[PDB]
Design a protein around this ligand. Structure first.
Ligand SMILES: NC(=O)C1=CN([C@@H]2O[C@H](COP(=O)(O)OP(=O)(O)OC[C@H]3O[C@@H](n4cnc5c(N)ncnc54)[C@H](OP(=O)(O)O)[C@@H]3O)[C@@H](O)[C@H]2O)C=CC1
Ligand SMILES: O=C(O)CCC(=O)C(=O)O
Length: 416
C-alpha cells in the first residue's frame, strides 16, 4: 500500500467532515516542492559511493517547513512525501508557525563508519543547501539519526553560509554545547502526560492513585511511565517490551524496571511481577493505556476487549480505524497519535526559537510553555470533538486542515 495514497485518502476523509474548497483540497494533496539529490561520499576504502537523498516540503503557508531526516535502507520518495504531509497536520494541530517537511537518505547506517556518517551528513547538506534554512526548512533527528548527525549538519551549513545568519536555527535536536535546548529528551513523554492530564480533567476523573499500563519500554515508554508516576501520581501497574511484559497490581518503579531491562536485556522476570504478554497488557483493566511501541497494536481483533478509559497514542498510529470506531462506541476517549506525541515537535520549535533569538531558556520555562501548548491544542481538539460529534482523530484532522486552509486563504494562494 502506497504511503502517499494512504495519506491522501486520510486527507480526503478529513475534508469530508469540513467545508473546504476543491481547489484547496487539490493543493493540499500535492507537496509544494520535492527535491531529489545525489549524495556522493568518499568511503573508507577510497572509493566513491553515491546515495539518493530526499527533501520534501509539503506546504509552507503557515511558515517554514519542519521535519526530520531518515537514514533507512528501505526509505522511498513516497514515504518522505507521506511523512511530510503528516508533519504538516502535526505542526498545525499544535499551532506552530511551521509547515510540513521531511527528508531521507536511502542508506544502511548500521554498516557505515563514524567518518563515513559525517561525510554523508555533510554531503547531504551540500546537496540540499539551496532548499533549507532557518526560515525555509528546518531538519530534525529521526529514525537512525541522532543529535551527533545534527551537529555535523549544522556545522556544514554554517560553513557554507559563511556565518551570515542564525546557523544554529537551521536544524533542531542539536547537542546542548551547540545551540541545543533543554527538555528535548523527555519532550514526547511530557506532552503525552499533559494530554493525559487534560483528558482526565475533561472526563472529570482524578488520576491520583489510578492505574496506567504502558506498552513498549523505550525512551518514550519509560519516560511516560516515570512522568506519570511522579507528576500524575498514577500507579504504573504494567509495562512491556517486544520481548515480553510484566504485571503487578501493587505498582512498579520505572527506574528499577529500566535498570533490570538494561542489565538482563528485557523487562521480563522482574521481581514481584508476573510475566505476561503484550496482548494481555493491552486488555488489562486500567484507567489510562499508553501504547508507546510498534504500530497497529489495537485492531478489530482486540478493540472490543479493551477496558481502559483513556487510550493515549504515544506511538505513531497504534489503532486501526475500525478499532477507533469500536473504542468510540465503547465510550473510551482516544487521544489522537499526532496530538499526543506533539511534544517533541513543540520542543523542537522551542529550540528553533531559542536559536533564532540567541537567548536560551531553562528547563522550567520549556516545561511551562510545553504545558500551555499541549493544553491549548488538546482542548481545541476536544471542543471540536464535542461540537462536531465526530471522532477525536477526525477532530484533530479538522483543526489542522482548517488552520492550514485559513493560512492558505489569507496568503491568496486559493481564492475560494
Ligand atoms: N523516537 C521519538 O523521538 C518519538 C517516537 N514516536 C513514536 O513512538 C514509538 C516509540 O518511540 P521510541 O521511544 O523511539 O521507540 P524505541 O525505538 O526507543 O524503543 C522501542 C520500544 O518499543 C518496544 N517494541 C518494539 N516492537 C514491539 C512490539 N512488537 N511489541 C511490544 N514492544 C515493542 C521495544 O522493546 P525492546 O526494548 O525489547 O526493543 C522498546 O521498548 C514509535 O512508534 C515512534 O514512531 C513519536 C514521537 C517521537
Ligand atoms: O521534531 C521534528 O521537528 C520532526 C520529527 C518528527 O518527524 C516527529 O516528531 O514525528
Amino acid at each position: 500500500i502506497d504511503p502517499f495514497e494512504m495519506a491522501v485518502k486520510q486527507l480526503e476523509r478529513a475534508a469530508q467532515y469540513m467545508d473546504i474548497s476543491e481547489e484547496a483540497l487539490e493543493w493540499l494533496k500535492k507537496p509544494m516542492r520535492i527535491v531529489e539529490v545525489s549524495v556522493p561520499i568518499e568511503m573508507d576504502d577510497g572509493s566513491v559511493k553515491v546515495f539518493t537523498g530526499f527533501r520534501v516540503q509539503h506546504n509552507w503557508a503557515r511558515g517554514p517547513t519542519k521535519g526530520g531526516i531518515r537514514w533507512h535502507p528501505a526509505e522511498t520518495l513516497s514515504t518522505v512525501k507521506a511523512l511530510a504531509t503528516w508533519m504538516t497536520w502535526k505542526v498545525a494541530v499544535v499551532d506552530l508557525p511551521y509547515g510540513g517537511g521531511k527528508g531521507g537518505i536511502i542508506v544502511n547506517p548500521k554498516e557505515l563508519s563514524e567518518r563515513e556518517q559525517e561525510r554523508l551528513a555533510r554531503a547531504y547538506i551540500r546537496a540540499v543547501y539551496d532548499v533549507i534554512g532557518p526560515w525555509t526548512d528546518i531538519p530534525a533527528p529521526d529514525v537512525y539519526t541522532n543529535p551527533k548527525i545534527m551537529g555535523w549538519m549544522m556545522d556544514e551549513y554554517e560553513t557554507i553560509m559563511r556565518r551570515k545568519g542564525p546557523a544554529f536555527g537551521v536544524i533542531t535536536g542539536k547537542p546542548l554545547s551547540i545551540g541545543g535546548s533543554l527538555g528535548r529528551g523527555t519532550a514526547t513523554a511530557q506532552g503525552a502526560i499533559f494530554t493525559i492530564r487534560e483528558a482526565a480533567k475533561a472526563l472529570g476523573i482524578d488520576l491520583k492513585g489510578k492505574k496506567i499500563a504502558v506498552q513498549g519500554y523505550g525512551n518514550a515508554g519509560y519516560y511516560t511511565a516515570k512522568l506519570a508516576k511522579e507528576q500524575l501520581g498514577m500507579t504504573v501497574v504494567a509495562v512491556s517490551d517486544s520481548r515480553g511484559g510484566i504485571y503487578n497490581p501493587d505498582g512498579l518503579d520505572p527506574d528499577e524496571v529500566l535498570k533490570w531491562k538494561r542489565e538482563h536485556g528485557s523487562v521480563k522476570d522482574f521481581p514481584g511481577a508476573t510475566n505476561i504478554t503484550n496482548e494481555e497488557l493491552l486488555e488489562l483493566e486500567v484507567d489510562v493505556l499508553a501504547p508507546a511501541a510498534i504500530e497497529e497494536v489495537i485492531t478489530e481483533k482486540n478493540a472490543d476487549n479493551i477496558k481502559a478509559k483513556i487510550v493515549a497514542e504515544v506511538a505513531n498510529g497504534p489503532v486501526t480505524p475500525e478499532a477507533d470506531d469500536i473504542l468510540r462506541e465503547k465510550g473510551i476517549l482516544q487521544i489522537p497519535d499526532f496530538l499526543c506525541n506533539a511534544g517533541g515537535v513543540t520542543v523542537s520549535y522551542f529550540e528553533w526559537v531559542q536559536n533564532i533569538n540567541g537567548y536560551y531558556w531553562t528547563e522550567e520555562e520549556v516545561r511551562e510553555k510545553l504545558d500551555k501548548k499541549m493544553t491549548k491544542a488538546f482542548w481545541e481538539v476536544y471542543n471540536t470533538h464535542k461540537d462536531k460529534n465526530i471522532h477525536m482523530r477526525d477532530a484533530a484532522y479538522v483543526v489542522a486542515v482548517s488552520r492550514v486552509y485559513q493560512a492558505m486563504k489569507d496568503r491568496g494562494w486559493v481564492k475560494k
